[PDB]
A = this chain, B = another copy of it.
Amino acid sequence: RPDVETQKTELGALMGTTLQRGAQWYLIDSRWFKQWKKYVGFDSWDMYNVGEHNLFPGPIDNSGLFSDPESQTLKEHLIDELDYVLVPAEAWNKLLNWYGCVEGQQPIVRKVVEHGLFVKHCKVEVYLLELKLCENSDPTNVLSCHFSKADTIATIEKEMRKLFNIPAERETRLWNKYMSNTYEQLSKLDNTIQDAGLYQGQVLVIEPQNEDGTWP
């Protein structure tokens, strides 16, 4: 880990990284990151470095972002710039090389996706859609799976063929079980998961065409 002046410079060179679709960004609790800035005097370019030595932040600690310490599920309702900051891969690597991280904490990496109801703009997708997937012929075998809001219904079917070994030449119908025994067919495989209005923990069942031609 080089001295604070050098850490300010190397990370300052990354100040202007733009969001590009598909790029990976990392979350850092802003408690840790704000302390780091005070330590290196990041928000101040004077002849003499202004960092505060006793604010040495130690290992990167994201435990504040976690609902559970064991599982490191992200808390819900975190606000960018308030609860955490987003750093490009290059900056994350520098900070991690320099400080290490709290034992057990996996890096919080997320991808840039393009979205918008009107104007399109990029953002880092911090919360993915969690779905429960199962196969018509064995409704008890249920798998949790996470999808991007920008992924399509096609993405989902494809994933389900993979998880349940449904031949790609076979015919399928995808059903949203949105109530006890009430189902809607997902047939517009072209559109995004948002366009479909699926909720977190939503149950989807895929139904393969029987080998004879019939339909369960």
Contacts and interface: CB of A to CB of B under 8 A. Distances in A.
A34 B191 CA distance: 13
A168 interface: no
Contacts of A17: 119
A87 B118 contact: yes
From A86, A117, A188, A195, name the one whose CB has the most chain B CB atoms within 10 angstroms. A117
Interface string A78-110: 000100011110010000000000000000000
A117 B15 contact: no
A44 interface: yes
Interface string A122-161: 0000000000000000000000000001000000000000
A211 to B, nearest CB: 33
Nearest to A91: B118
A16 to B, nearest CB: 7
B34 A119 contact: no
B116 A81 contact: yes
A66 interface: no
A108 to B, nearest CB: 15
From A88, A118, A149, name the one whose CB has the most chain B CB atoms within 10 angstroms. A118
Given A15-B120, A81-B117, A88-B119, 20 more contacts: A14-B119, A15-B118, A17-B119, A30-B117, A33-B118, A34-B197, A43-B191, A43-B195, A44-B188, A44-B190, A44-B191, A81-B115, A81-B116, A81-B149, A85-B116, A85-B118, A86-B118, A86-B119, A87-B118, A91-B118
For the complex of A and B, 6 pairs with smallest distance between CB atoms: A85-B117, A43-B195, A85-B118, A43-B191, A15-B119, A87-B118
Interface of A: 11, 14-17, 30, 33-34, 37, 43-44, 77, 81, 85-88, 91, 115-120, 149, 188, 190-191, 194-195, 197
